[PDB]
Amino acid sequence: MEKKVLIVGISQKQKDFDYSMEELANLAAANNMEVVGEIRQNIDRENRATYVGKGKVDEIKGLAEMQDARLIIFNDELSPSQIRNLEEALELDVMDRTGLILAIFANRAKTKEAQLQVQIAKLQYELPRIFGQGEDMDQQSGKGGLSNRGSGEKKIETDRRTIKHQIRHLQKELDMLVDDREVRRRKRKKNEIPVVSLVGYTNAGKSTTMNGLVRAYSETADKQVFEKDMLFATLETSVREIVLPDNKQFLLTDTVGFVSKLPHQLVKAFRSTLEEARDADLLIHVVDYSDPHYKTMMKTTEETLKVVGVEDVPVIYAYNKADLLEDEMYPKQTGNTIIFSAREEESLEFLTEVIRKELFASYEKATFLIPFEAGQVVAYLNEHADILETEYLENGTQIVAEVSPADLQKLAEYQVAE
Amino acid sequence: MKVRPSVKPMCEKCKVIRRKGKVMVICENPKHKQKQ
Amino acid sequence: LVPKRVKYRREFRGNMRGRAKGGTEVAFGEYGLQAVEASWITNRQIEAARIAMTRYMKRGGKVWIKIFPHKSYTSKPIGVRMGKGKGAPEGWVSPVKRGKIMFEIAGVPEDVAREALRLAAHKLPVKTKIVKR
Amino acid sequence: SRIGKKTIVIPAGVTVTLNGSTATVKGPKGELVKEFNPEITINIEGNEINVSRPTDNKNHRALHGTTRAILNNMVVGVSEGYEKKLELIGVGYRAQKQGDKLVLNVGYSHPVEFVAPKGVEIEVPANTQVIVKGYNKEHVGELAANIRAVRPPEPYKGKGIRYEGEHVRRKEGKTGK
Amino acid sequence: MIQQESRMKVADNSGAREVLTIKVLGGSGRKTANIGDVVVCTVKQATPGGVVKKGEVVKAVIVRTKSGARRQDGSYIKFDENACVIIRDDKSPRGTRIFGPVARELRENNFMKIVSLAPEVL
RNA sequence: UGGCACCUCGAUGUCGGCUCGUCGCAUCCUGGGGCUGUAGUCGGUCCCAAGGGUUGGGCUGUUCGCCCAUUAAAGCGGCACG
RNA sequence: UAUGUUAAGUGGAAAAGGAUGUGGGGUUGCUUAGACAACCAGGAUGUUGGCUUAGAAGCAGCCACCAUUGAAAGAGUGCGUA
Ligand SMILES: Nc1nc2c(ncn2[C@@H]2O[C@H](COP(=O)(O)OP(=O)(O)CP(=O)(O)O)[C@@H](O)[C@H]2O)c(=O)[nH]1
Ligand SMILES: [K+]
Ligand SMILES: [Mg+2]
Ligand SMILES: [Mg+2]
Ligand SMILES: [Mg+2]
Ligand SMILES: [Mg+2]
Ligand SMILES: [Mg+2]
Ligand SMILES: [Mg+2]
Ligand SMILES: [Mg+2]
Ligand SMILES: [Mg+2]
Ligand SMILES: [Mg+2]
Ligand SMILES: [Mg+2]
Ligand SMILES: [Zn+2]
């Protein structure tokens, strides 16, 4: 059924501390749990032993036993000794934000890449905590003496080695999977298709933008990407063709969303996943302009991109949800900023116009004379470049069109000087 | 070649034959070559 | 598929001797899967088979599940010895005897029905066959 | 066996004889000798050869058919003969011969040399055209296959050595963009 | 005979003065290096203000050893020290001057600039 | 990693290293091949194959591991954890 | 001894699945007014059906799928061109 939980937080000199508890409640509501009470404390430093102090523990226990809760959720990462102390004091179950995010990710992992990533993150998180957890059985006080027969080791060494071993096996499987993944990018790298990637915060509107663009400018436009409010809807990346009316081709990629106060054991998984965004040719930053806190989001967004390791890539900041705001006109371009609504034909037209302006800038005018009997080149021009005017001459076809340097070099014999 | 316990046709031009006591599939598409 | 409540939390495992008592004929739809052997069938297997065979038909026609997981089973963790009482319940199971019809479908032609039942039968731990009313 | 029941009409100038299971065929172009299993039997008269089938079971049917086919090919090869033709495709691909030795320049750092065995001959109408001739199906086929195996055709340009009756499966070097 | 942990005096113009050898190149189980062989090494003493700095990992060629070389006509050569010259990825020196005598074996291994810059090629 | 308690409590020496190896193949290198999202270069994957080969250091009692510098390559396991 | 089966050394070790192995039965279509397989010949005309496209001529795609001579001959089964 649904479990009853509590959420506990300290001010800790955070600048807001209120959106943090709001999003913690939202995350709990995304794990088939409901918040039946929150406790906050305005302490500028974190308690070393119980994270809240002596009196707050009793207050929390009283509220939990009055509201009939089954678990307590703490807004920040805990310590193994803190977990031991809180569990002993409360006589309940204790869980922290990192555990909550891992729980959210575990049951939404479909492809085994995500499943293995979450598995390794969970084992890495639980590895330091097993010390006092297993000492209760290990610290049996009475075990023996000198024996002249034995393992030549103490039990702590043995169980440390056992827990250390399996981590390497799981990481090895991860590495093999990523190496296999690099095989499927061979065709993209061998050719030189430009790539543009959508990034941003969660529920910003990336998937809707991608679906609109795909419906507008794709051959197999029936290939849509899932969209919803919920929570981390897309846990996988997608790549699609986009072909423009002026006969230009590029690839559009979609990736996952993130949230503030992100665990460090899972940022490695995100760094593995965002490897397509790392080698992108253009970045589109979707921002939910309607949300008042959106500004804060932008900062934390760059922070994530600073950690996975994507930099020096041109970025266009797109402000979604323009229709939800009153007394505003859209689409509009200001510097490297776009104001638009994803569910609009004209907004998508403006965004794709901006993309075409930014990426393709080395398509210059050129004139070619293709002889009639030696034809089969006008088709290449029309299906690989945008033409302006062609003429039916007695000696052949006189075409003028704007092309790329590769086309110029390939068609260097047909050029005519002026 | 694909070496599997479950050799079966993959298109409508695949053909199932036996050679040296082994079941196998031949086709015009070389990706469809299977041996059991 | 889990029962809402039970009178007892622990139960004997039972046996599977003999032919199925009832439910050996197609009674609602036109097509059915019949068990040829006996087996425990869990609710994960039922759910996987149902999703496969329903997705193939694109939510057309009707599907009837003729078995329910009434029985529960327990287990013991790694590292515990024998004794000290019975273990904790894990899942829910249906014991299926030979001859039992466990899935029925209607509302689709021969080809769709037979292919959906073939797709479903590969998710199950028992040896099956396809029968028509 | 429909094949096994068909009659063999002996052409003029070729003679066929039986020594037990062994069969010998002579004519304008050469002499052949071959051994068959005794379970099958052959009749002899002026201008017809008939191979008969004692039993109707599997291997016996197959042997009947293949015995008739082998006799037919043997007699035809002695009488008229057999040939195969080979083409070379590619820039610089050259076929030549010095006496009784075929020399191929097919893109390696060294030329490839071929010498025909007894009963088989190699002819070079043009620098990119080879012909294998002989009065034995198996040997002509084997030598043509050996020559072709030096540089079989490749799917990106068609270059290599191929039969005239070959359709090469063609692929495109660069696709996707 | 230069193997790992043996130290050499640097005989060229670059900032290094003494070098400790880390690896003898040219095979998996190779142990010693002779005149005309390349080694990987680290700078133990340096001259302040030079191009090569202390603690740098470089590679160098041995130009004279205390157990020298035998020639094919039956004669031998030996020196009173072990000395090396710091080189680039090609066989060119990283200095502008070379001090002391150099063995003739550098010419067979195609170290032409080192041979031309030396005061004497014995 | 466990379960059981069948031989040994009128004794079956217990970790790591050193010396000396030997065997399996689910093959790390080298040899032969089919498919490729195999143009070439560089690769991926599978089939055959156990003939030979398969590094020196810093830290830690460590096995393992991380790092430095190499190599064609720095395989995984059994033999009372030989 | 009699009548059959198996070609794996199955017999003398192991499952889900996969398969023109082989034997025995039971139904059903066509055929000496000529069946199945090969060989010879034809396989046509309005017409490049309309739309779309720079094109689209049976064979990128959408909507139609008629008529004539004639033994039949698709507004086309696949390859191929741009
Ligand atoms: N009013 C308005 N609503 C919009 C606009 N664009 C998107 N939305 C709403 O916001 C939601 C965006 O969801 P989605 O794009 O799937 O979020 P997401 O970025 O994929 C979250 P994740 O990172 O997990 O994939 C949609 O359900 C849509 O209804 C807009 O321009 N105007
Ligand atoms: K089954
Ligand atoms: Mg003690
Ligand atoms: Mg010396
Ligand atoms: Mg030293
Ligand atoms: Mg005793
Ligand atoms: Mg050390
Ligand atoms: Mg190397
Ligand atoms: Mg061992
Ligand atoms: Mg199975
Ligand atoms: Mg049978
Ligand atoms: Mg016919
Ligand atoms: Zn096929």
Describe this structure in words.
Chain E: It holds the Pfam family Ribosomal_L14. Chain E: InterPro entries: Ribosomal_uL14 (IPR000218), Ribosomal_uL14_bac-type (IPR005745), Ribosomal_uL14_CS (IPR019972), Ribosomal_uL14_sf (IPR036853). Chain E: Mg(2+) binds at residue 5. The structure is cut from a larger assembly and holds chains A (418 residues), B (36 residues), C (133 residues), D (177 residues) and E (122 residues). Chain A has 418 residues and is α/β, with parallel strands linked by helices. Chain A has two domains: 4-105, Rossmann fold, CATH 3.40.50.11060; 169-359, Rossmann fold, CATH 3.40.50. Chain A is built from 15 helices and 14 strands. Chain C is of the alpha+beta class and 133 residues long. Helix content of chain C is 20%, strand content 29%. Chain C is built from two helices and seven strands. Chain C has helices at 43-56, 110-121; strands at residues 31-35, 39-42, 62-65, 71-75, 88-96, 101-106, 128-132. In chain C, the strands form two sheets. In chain C, strands 3-6-1-7 form a four-stranded antiparallel beta sheet, with helices on one face. In chain C, strands 2-5-4 form a three-stranded antiparallel beta sheet. With 177 residues, chain D is an alpha+beta fold. Helix content of chain D is 21%, strand content 35%. Chain D has helices at 2-5, 58-79, 137-148, and strands at residues 8-9, 15-19, 22-26, 31-35, 41-44, 48-52, 82-89, 94-97, 102-105, 112-114, 120-126, 129-134, 160-163. In chain D, the strands form four sheets. A four-stranded antiparallel beta sheet of chain D has the order 11-12-7-13. A three-stranded antiparallel beta sheet of chain D has the order 1-6-5, covered by helices on one side. In chain D, β2 (15-19) and β3 form a beta hairpin. The radius of gyration of chain D is 21 Å and the shape is elongated. Chain E has one domain (1-122). In chain E, β1 (7-10) and β2 form a beta hairpin. Chain E contains two helices and seven strands. In chain E, the strands form two sheets. A five-stranded mixed beta barrel of chain E has the order 1-2-3-4-7. In chain E, strands 5-6 form a two-stranded antiparallel ribbon. Chain E has 122 residues and is mainly beta. Chains A and D meet through loops of A and loops of D. The structure holds phosphomethylphosphonic acid guanylate ester, potassium ion, magnesium ion (10 copies) and zinc ion (ZN). Potassium ion binds next to loops of chain C. The structure holds two RNA strands.
Secondary structure layout:
The structure is cut from a larger assembly and holds chains A (418 residues), B (36 residues), C (133 residues), D (177 residues) and E (122 residues).
Chain A: E1 3-10, H1 18-29, E2 33-41, H2 54-67, E3 71-74, H3 80-90, E4 94-96, H4 97-107, H5 112-126, H6 130-138, H7 155-181, H8 186-190, E5 195-200, H9 206-216, E6 238-243, E7 249-254, H10 264-273, H11 275-278, E8 282-288, H12 294-308, E9 315-320, E10 332-334, E11 337-339, H13 345-359, E12 364-371, H14 378-384, E13 386-392, E14 396-403, H15 405-410
Parallel strand pairs in A: 1-2, 1-3, 3-4, 5-7, 5-8, 8-9, 9-11
Antiparallel strand pairs in A: 6-7, 10-11, 12-14, 13-14
Chain B: E1 2-3, E2 15-19, E3 22-26, E4 34-35
Parallel strand pairs in B: 1-4
Antiparallel strand pairs in B: 2-3, 3-4
Chain C: E1 31-35, E2 39-42, H1 43-56, E3 62-65, E4 71-75, E5 88-96, E6 101-106, H2 110-121, E7 128-132
Antiparallel strand pairs in C: 1-6, 1-7, 2-5, 3-6, 4-5
Helix pairs in contact in C: 1-2
The structure holds phosphomethylphosphonic acid guanylate ester, potassium ion, magnesium ion (10 copies) and zinc ion (ZN).
Chain A binds 2 RNA strands through residues 147-153, 157, 161-162, 164-165, 168, 179-180, 182-188, 190, 375-380, 382, 387, 390.
